[PDB]
Amino acid sequence: RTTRDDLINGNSASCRDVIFIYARGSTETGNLGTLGPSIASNLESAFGKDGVWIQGVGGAYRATLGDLALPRGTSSAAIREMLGLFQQANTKCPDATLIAGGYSQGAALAAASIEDLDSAIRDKIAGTVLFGYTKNLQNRGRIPNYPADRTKVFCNTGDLVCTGSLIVAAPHLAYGPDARGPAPEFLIEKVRAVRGS
Template sequence: MKLTASFLSLLFASGVVATPISVDSLRVERGLGGDELSSDGLQARQSTSLTANEFNTGGCKDVVLVFARGTAQLGNLGATPGLPLYNQIKSALGSGNVAVQGVNYDAVAHGTLPEGVDATAANNMATLITKVANNCPDAAILVSGYSQGAAMVHASIKRVTATVKARINAAVTFGDTRNEQDGGTIPGISADRTLIICNDGDEVCDGTLEITAAHLQYTPRVPEAVSFMKSKV
């Protein structure tokens, strides 16, 4: 079953959804407003692709953003907030100055695992971040993720060396499933380089692994993330 964001909004507004929906059972396959999102290559302006492999295919830029999508989201960015973040960070810093690399992992349910993610996936993300740090000594490195992707940020940063941790200019999470467990921090990243964005009413930020409407509404918070990232590069 495919659900549009507008249809989901209608369900929540009408009270049809009386209890929280499991974060691992929801699949959103359309973009905001119900428009189909293409799987074409990324464009310089207002991309609609859910996949970004700009570091893997094009190498270093002045800024490299590594982003991990949430559970069951398509591509390696997901429709929200990954795609809006892609477009807005490009707009803020200049498209030619930023390489966005989505994390290629299965993004299936791993809520019962100790870190909330598959260890192999976390190792692979750590390897990607390390590769960016080693290959791009002059680049500013940004790391971000949504929902399970936020847990990927926590788990992967734990796995990189202190030298690589020091290279990360900013770590930003949305709807962070490890917020409660890690005490509102991302271990290994100083507070001044950390931004954890949690909406009021988003129960996954309280460690419940259940989502309400608030967990689906992070696109309006993307400008906050971009402003923070811009201030750190």
């Protein structure tokens, strides 16, 4: 379903090897929204249920549509909430490999959080996927301070938010197939590249 709090609920004595932190789009439900569940089920198939913890960004992140217009594409409160989850993962499970993702406002949130994150923690994020990245043009398809090889952006032709606008057109709502195949495929490949088998 749309709410997963595996990191918050998880036991430090039995940490998963992989922790996925994901931010939903504006007005979406739970803490995973429309795309998160599809990615989650595929990660679970590859690493097994006890092998991966799925954590959505909830709490202070209310995914308010109007916040897309703020300087960083989301609110300060939301960034602090996502930063807190990365810090929680790092303290709770020091040896877990992290992966991240975000859709629309959540993609701006993921980018802002990763930019502000302490380098020692940021460097543990093996891969990040962004769908309908609202700061795609502004950041030239990159996440500041984060390697291009660990980044995968899914920006549909005709998705105006990828070209510097805040208009929501039909292509912005067409990332379903990407969340079902290429996105988890990329995340799995990036985790295996560093963890092996």
